[PDB]
Structures are given as structure tokens and as C-alpha cells.
Amino acid sequence: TCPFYKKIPGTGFTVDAFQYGVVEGCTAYFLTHFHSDHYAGLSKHFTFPVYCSEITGNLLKNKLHVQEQYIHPLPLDTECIVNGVKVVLLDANHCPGAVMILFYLPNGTVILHTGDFRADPSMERSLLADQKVHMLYLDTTYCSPEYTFPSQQEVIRFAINTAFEAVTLNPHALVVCGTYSIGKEKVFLAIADVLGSKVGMSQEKYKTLQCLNIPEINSLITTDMCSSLVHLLPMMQINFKGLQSHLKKCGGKYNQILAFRPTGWTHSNKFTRIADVIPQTKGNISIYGIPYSEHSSYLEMKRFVQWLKPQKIIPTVNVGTWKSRSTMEKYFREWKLEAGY
Ligand code: NI
């Protein structure tokens, strides 16, 4: 049964609620983004209207085979009427095609559902600037002050400079980047661009990337592994055993691996600056864990909320334990007392 924080009151709508069977009273199912914890339950046998971005709808049709007649893609930043209710989709600054959803209820209440997001000051000049929001359904993934990480731009600077130095020292070094979902494509695209290479990958991953409307993508990626010196592998293979096995398959073209694991936060964040990050090394293999986040840091989240000044907050992440719930509720009250709303 569907939990309350996935239901939009005063509508027939649910958000990211596909694993509960037929939800009683639901006339339209919204999907914020194409990550498995959110789409869990969708398939070619789904027969209710799904509302989403264009990029998400490309993924639903090509990867999950949802039939076209049930996919309802909406343009961003545009007022649309769904089953008698005005909605807007906004860029979530998460993975490709990820949105926040503004619902203008028939009684005058305005609700923002962030989906998954990485809050940014640029959101203060979107269509959110124009009216009051009563209720916020918030991605609380990193809602605690220990969760610090650098900007995406600092992290990409570190990756490009590290890869360019290693390969210029040793033109027979291969770069490998780990992946297990969409998101974080800048990591492997920025490294391949500094090296003058395409990114090489499996047919299944190439298919996924071809759904993402990235400009000039045919110029940047390939299934021809032999022609590429930046390879994408599943995240599970980014370890000394998996990388040794891969290097064997490359037929003596390469004699060293430099590998990247874009994690979110790890506790090595609490002590060390990005500048000071070092790899784990074994022989001719080195592995870097880089803190590339597609979720808000604590400070980014707190700024967004203190700007928006909602009347009520409903967390959508970390909701399963009483300790987590109590921690989050204490920060929400602090924020509100400090800002005065
Ligand atoms: Ni996500």
C-alpha cells in the first residue's frame, strides 16, 4: 500500500508510486525521474496515464517498453492542465530528465514536490518566484550538517586535471569510469573531451545515453571499445579484481588503469579537501572516489527552504526511522526560527 507522502491531497495524483498495484483513487501517475527506486513497478503492461518530462518518456518507451499511448511528456517551465488541475514541471538539477512538480490545487493551496534535487540559487529565479507555496514534499537525503561536499565544477576540475596528467605521463594508460544508473555523465564526458577521445561502452549503456537529448552526443560516445581510451564499466566492476580482468581483455594496448568511482558523500568528506584526495593503488591500478553529488548538501537545502518559506514540510527520504524523523523535524524548526517565517 502506497504511503501518504506519495499522495497529492485534493487531487487524483500520485508521485513515484508504481510498485503498489492499482492505487485507489489515482487518475494520473507522475514520475519525477528515471531512477529504479522511483520507477519500481513500471513495464510494457502498465495501462494508466504516466506524466513526466520528454527525456523520462524516451527512457520509459525504449528501456522499459511502456506503450506510447500511456506516455504523456510535458514541456518544462510551461503551465499545463492535467485532469482539471494546473501543473508546472521545473528542472530538478538531478540526473537528465529529472523534474520538480508545482501543483495548483482547486482550493487555492500550492504544493511543490522536489522529486530528487540538488538545490541551487538559480531556482530562486524560476517560476517559483511568482507565488506562495504552502506545502513542500522535500528530498531530505543529506539533511544533517555533516554532509558537506564541493561544487560539481570543482570536482570535474579535479577529475580532468588528474586524468590529463596521468595519460600525458603514460600514453599507454586507460581511464575507466564506473556507472549503474543515469546521472553524473559530466564525469566521463569531461575526461574524454580533455583526452581527445570518445567514451566507449556496452550496447545497453549506449542505448540509454541515446535517449537523453545531450547535444552533439554522436560525436562523444561509441560502442567501439578499441577506438576509445575512456571506458565505462558497471560500478560493481570498479575494484582491483574487476579492473585487472578488464586490462587483460584489452590485448596489450594498455599497461596501467586510472579509475573513477563518482560516489555521493563518504566520511572521507569530513576531514579532507577535494585538492587533497588520493587514490587506492595496487600495482598498475589506481582507484579515485570522487564526491560528485546530484543531491543537495545540507547548506544548499537549508538556503532553498529558508528562501521558499513553506508552511509545512513533508520529507520524502530518511522517513523509515524515528531518530531520522526527529532529527529532520528539529532542523526544520531551527530554520524557521532563524529566518522568521
Ligand atoms: Ni534519484
Which amino acid, 203? Q
Distance (angstroms) between ligand 1 centre and the Cα of 36 equals: 8
On whether the CB atoms of residues 105 and 111 are closer than 8 A, the answer is yes
Distance (angstroms) between ligand 1 centre and the Cα of 170 equals: 37
* Distances in whole angstroms, Cα of residue 284 to Cα of each of 121, 170, 172, 199, 316: 42, 11, 11, 22, 43
The Cα–Cα gap between 320 and 180 comes to 25
Q: How far apart are the first and last CA of the chain?
A: 35
User: 3-class SS at 155?
Assistant: helix
User: 3-class SS at 274?
Assistant: helix
Distance (angstroms) between ligand 1 centre and the Cα of 29 equals: 17
User: 3-class SS at 321?
Assistant: coil
Grid cell, residue 233, equals: 564499466
Nearest to 35 by CA among 118, 97, 88: 97
Distance (angstroms) between ligand 1 centre and the Cα of 55 equals: 14
How is the chain split among helix, strand and coil, in percent rounded to 5? Answer: 35, 20, 45
On the CB side of 173, CA atoms within 13 Å amount to 19
Could you tell me which residues come within 8 angstroms of residue 248 by beta carbon, excluding any fewer than 6 positions away?
Answer: none
Q: Sign of dihedral through CA atoms 164, 165, 171, 174?
A: negative
Nearest to 138 by CA among 333, 332, 320, 291: 332
Question: Any bridge partners for residue 259, and if so which?
Answer: 176, 287
The Cα–Cα gap between 221 and 314 comes to 40
Could you tell me which residues come within 8 angstroms of residue 223 by beta carbon, excluding any fewer than 6 positions away?
Answer: 200, 201, 202, 203, 206
Annotate 25-51 with DSSP letters as a single string: T-SEEE-----HHHHTT--TT--S-EE
Distance (angstroms) between ligand 1 centre and the Cα of 98 equals: 8
Nearest to 208 by CA among 93, 92, 60: 60
**Technique used to solve these coordinates:** X-ray
- CATH, range 1-147+296-341: 3.60.15.10
Grid cell, residue 308, equals: 521558499
Resolution (A): 1.2
User: 3-class SS at 199?
Assistant: strand
On whether the CB atoms of residues 147 and 297 are closer than 8 A, the answer is yes
User: 3-class SS at 236?
Assistant: helix
* Calculated CA dihedral for residues 77, 81, 82, 83, nearest 10 degrees: 170
Distance (angstroms) between ligand 1 centre and the Cα of 256 equals: 33
On the CB side of 276, CA atoms within 13 Å amount to 6
The DSSP element (H or E) to which 207 belongs, if any, is helix 203-210
Q: Which region, left, alpha or beta, applies to residue 104 given φ > 0 means left and ψ of -120 to 50 means alpha? A: beta
Nearest to 297 by CA among 144, 174, 76: 144
Nearest to 292 by CA among 180, 152, 175: 152
Grid cell, residue 328, equals: 529532520
**196-202: which pairs have CB atoms within 8 A and are 24 or more residues apart?**
197/228, 197/229, 197/230, 198/222, 198/224, 198/227, 198/228, 198/230, 199/228, 199/230, 199/231, 199/232, 200/224, 200/225, 200/227, 200/228, 200/230, 200/231, 200/232, 201/225, 201/231, 201/232, 202/232
Nearest to 182 by CA among 70, 300, 94: 94
Distance (angstroms) between ligand 1 centre and the Cα of 30 equals: 15
Q: Where are the domains of the chain?
A: 1-147+296-341, 148-295
CB atoms within 10 A of CB 73: 17
Distance (angstroms) between ligand 1 centre and the Cα of 340 equals: 32
- CATH, range 148-295: 3.40.50.12650
Distance of CA 193 to the CA centre of its chain: 22
